[PDB]
Amino acid sequence: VTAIQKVIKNAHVHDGLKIGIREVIKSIESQEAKVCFLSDVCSEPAYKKLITTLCAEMVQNDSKDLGHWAGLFIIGASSVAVVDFGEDSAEKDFLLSQ
């Protein structure tokens, strides 16, 4: 769980985070979103279904936590989509391997 925060920070630093539903969807529909952090605790789980199917063609808990991790200082995030990353080594070699 602590291996995600670093990645998010790196993404923030090097400009490429599609944060919040529609943007995430757009990123997915095209070869840009290289990893998708979504959530479990939602409403309707229709969102979740949409995400999963799109991925198929990480999961994780809660929205507030995601918002905190994302650039909001804190409105509900729902889903994040990372492009570019911006660095290597340390805790990216863990999470990716896992």
Q: Which residues, in sequence order, are CB contacts of 86 under 8 Å at separation 6+? A: 10, 11, 13, 14, 16
CATH 3.90.1150.10 for domain 1-98, yes or no, is no
In the block, which residue shows the tokens 């999963």?
Answer: 52
Experimental method reported for this structure = cryo-EM
Q: Which residues, in sequence order, are CB contacts of 36 under 8 Å at separation 6+? A: 24, 28, 51, 54, 55, 58, 79, 80, 81, 82
Q: Are 81 and 7 in contact (CB under 8 A)?
A: no
What is the spatial distance between Cα 97 and Cα 45, in angstroms, rounded to a whole number? Answer: 28
Q: Resolution in A for the shown PDB structure?
A: 3.3
| 55: alpha, beta or left? (left if phi > 0; alpha if psi -120 to 50) | alpha
The 3-state secondary structure of the chain reads CHHHHHHHHHHHHHCCEEECCHHHHHHHCCCCCCEEECCCCCCCCHHHHHHHHHHHCCCCCCCHHHHHHCCCCCCCCCCEEECCCCCCCCCHHHHHHC
